[PDB]
Symmetry: C6
Subunit: 221 residues, 6 copies
């Protein structure tokens, strides 16, 4: 990564083995779970493209997903090149070259080049551009690797509501829809797939009800 | 977090992976237990809003609680906006803007903005405002996720008093009432739900008695 | 804690997570055992009241003891206020206020106030005053939570003396009496509760005997 | 390794034991798996030849492979000497000597000599030359120690496609062919060795299809 | 301990928790074994008396030994006071007081006093004096807690010599005799308690023989 | 060890506990295996004689070997004294004394003396002299503690060649002979003790064959 030194300049320092291993261990343990994305984001703080390929290349397993991601990274990169055309005429001696999708992916650029772009004034955030592609591609994966739809979430005849509400906001946690739609899902689908005994109870709370009151309301059921 | 550097200035530094993992592990092991709140408080020392969303977003499991907290954070934020109206006229060039509930929640503010407010003179403690909302919402959770009332705490016919007194100050530990009320509970409920054989013993100690003397008094029983 | 910086001044720095966890783990493993007190003492080196409440508040379990300690801390604090009356007239602009029992307990004082008192010249050792209350209250606990009296320590008919002498200085280790009394216990009670076969042996060593010679004397028995 | 000091010069510092042990542990756990090569590459950042022989010499087990590598290192070294002849006439007093294959392998050079070449201006990247030989020899090993050919990868009659596609890009991950050939393998071999029921399904998707659509297309099969 | 700071002065710094725990763990695992003494010695590098009482007081278990040590520490301390009488007349204002046995044991001295003596010019090595008492008392313990005499070491009728020679230099490792005596034991007792079949073999090697030749000589036996 | 400080001087610093423990753990796990020697060599970087006796004295177990080593260290030391006679006349006030075998073994020298010799200009490498004696004595041990001769390595009638070739370069790894002899062993003994079915196969490869081609040639056998 590129970090600030004591002297007050930005210099490159290598990433740590127990950081590396922590990246490995996350993937081992939580596979495609959503917590992987904030986790990634923290461990990618101040990271280079080069370090990001290192992290992706050091994965073992889940090769269908790893290929889907690659192909997303190239699509997003192809899109970078499309949206940002190359600039007019020859490159100035006094200046350094604009990046392409493949420089952002780290492929066509060298480390010193990656440090030039980020440390220079203005700086360009080629990490953050790759980061969105990674996060976007992470959404693709998460959405695919979900095994059950939100409509299929229902309360058992003997299942406590509580255990059901947990299941609901876990699956709701894997839905990516607008907040307004997710509000609609909350007031609607939760009660609808609730069991008759609690359903009866919840109808008596009326509208305007909040989760602690619903959760304490269906406790004996 | 925002920490003081050797040079004698306040600069941002990233939070550590074994700090992150220690946050994870606490939640894994002690779930909704009260020790989570001092623990949180220590690990949130010098932390940003941004770091606090990172910690909340990196949770897995207990999604009913995570949703209840979110909704508490937004309520407390809505309340921030209510209580503190926006200020008169346009924002000065010489000054930086006052925060809203969503800047405190980290949502509408950027990191550099979060560092401006905290490092500037006077500084504003947007961490500590979010921290109270988190702690308040933690009380809500703790109180809900308690499974047994203090009136339901009673001593068995063969159960040592000692094991009962431990149960009492654990449940008393999940009561949040004024100290005077909790004093009333101490002198009253403890003896009342104590078993006849020890109850008899405790009546002979009279009033004014302290816990070592009660605890040594009912030892053979 | 308040530690000395490289520059040569006393500044506050936060306590470490694997220090925190080491405090937790000690309590988990050795509960009320005496080794907890030196252990505490080492891990409390340079610690604030605030850090000491953090350590006490982060306990789980042993709530009867935790309440007994609290009540000891308040008694010792009540006693601080009694012994040291408030001072004559209004507080000087040029000076900072004298502490009360509750400032020592950390309750009524702020961190910056706790740093004022300790870093200022003369410094006042409010940590060490709370530390004695903690250690005193630790003695109360240790003495209560002992399950067996020193008179009840006796040597089996088939038990090696050696295993008995170990038991003796462990229980002697939980007696807090004057050294002279503990010397009296050594020469007296040890031999008296020793088994007839070894007892016979020990009578032949005469007086003036030391532990290696007693321990080698009753080896075949 | 040779690292940059705070003062702003390149100095040698020793490699760490938990770095050493992490190298050991990788080899223990993942043997000849491809993830070993990026892993190696990260842990070899700023490393000397001397440190690279240390890492190779500290291996236990897989001695057939260790010998194959040695013999590759000597072949690649023999090739260095061939391609780069020794230079004209005697060595200048003002200059330091050009390396041979054996200096690159660390064998004929001393540490101070290895630091002369790398720290001097222009610097020569004798680490990176050995690194390619190691990576090249790692490819030789990986290719040999593969146990199954890509043509032998086929979908079971009851096996989900998904589990098969994972197997495919794992084996494709151990093929080293040009990208164009690997594209040809993707569109061709995958469908061809797919089972009749899914094969039927995939024929209906037509051409132009992408992996999420294939993977969702054969899900019920 | 008292360590040298970067500035080039000797200052006190606290001992580390995983150092503390490493001391604990050694004692847990290897009890009275001789490896405990070099181990102790390394972990006591630059240590104070105060830190040495901390280490002794934090022991759990082996209380017979802990008492024997205490009593050795006081004997060695009584001996310090005997051998070094107090000095003539009153203590000079310009000077600091000479230590007693109890200052060396850390008991009557304060930390700042322990730092005065060690940091001052000439310095006095009160650590190293206590260290010898600890090591001396460690010898007492080791010698007592040995369970078997060197004369009782003999080779089985089916036991390989090799396994016997290991037993011999382990027990020889717990003998503390002059080197000349230990040489006498080597050439004598080893062969004498060797089994008839190997004994026969060893008689054929003659005198002047070394351990690799004895060890290869009795291999088939 | 003696390490370079930030200021740019060579100063002594103590070795770390998890370094110590890593030395212990190596010995526990890999006993007399050859990987112990590079491992030793890395962990002995910048080490003193004093630290080297500490490492040897802290061993538990393998006391026959520990004695053989001691006796090798003294032999090598006796040889140092023989080869390097003491120098002419009295020692100069302006100079420091030449070392003997016992100063190299650390026995007759003090730490400050060990730092004088190493830090002084010219420096003398008393570590590296002891290091060779340790490595030499390590060869003695390794060669003795080998349990099987290279001639006894043969391929089973059902054993894959591959598993046999691994055994061969492991045992070849414990042979210390000239490279030319070891080349002779490679082309000769490997094929000779190979099974008839593969032996037949290998005869068809002719001469000039390399290990990947032999290893792929006898794969179906």
């Amino acid at each position: 990564p590129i970090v600030q030194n004591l002297q007050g300049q930005m210099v490159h320092q290598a990433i740590s083995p127990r950081t590396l291993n922590a990246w490995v261990k996350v993937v081992e343990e939580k596979a495609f779970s959503p917590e992987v994305i904030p986790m990634f984001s923290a461990l990618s703080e101040g990271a280079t493209p080069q370090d990001l390929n290192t992290m992706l290349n050091t994965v073992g397993g889940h090769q269908a997903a790893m290929q889907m991601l690659k192909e997303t990274i190239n699509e997003e990169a192809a899109e970078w090149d499309r949206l940002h055309p190359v600039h007019a005429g020859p490159i100035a001696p006094g200046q350094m070259r604009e990046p392409r999708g493949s420089d952002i992916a780290g492929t066509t650029s060298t480390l010193q080049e990656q440090i030039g772009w980020m440390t220079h004034n203005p700086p360009i955030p080629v990490g953050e551009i790759y980061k969105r592609w990674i996060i976007l591609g992470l959404n693709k994966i998460v959405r695919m690797y979900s095994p059950t739809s939100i409509l299929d979430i229902r309360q058992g005849p003997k299942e406590p509501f509580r255990d059901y509400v947990d299941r609901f906001y876990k699956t709701l946690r894997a839905e990516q829809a607008s907040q307004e739609v997710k509000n609609w899902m909350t007031e609607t689908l939760l009660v609808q797939n609730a069991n008759p005994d609690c359903k009866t109870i919840l109808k008596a709370l009326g509208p305007g009800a909040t989760l602690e009151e619903m959760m304490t309301a269906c406790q004996g059921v």
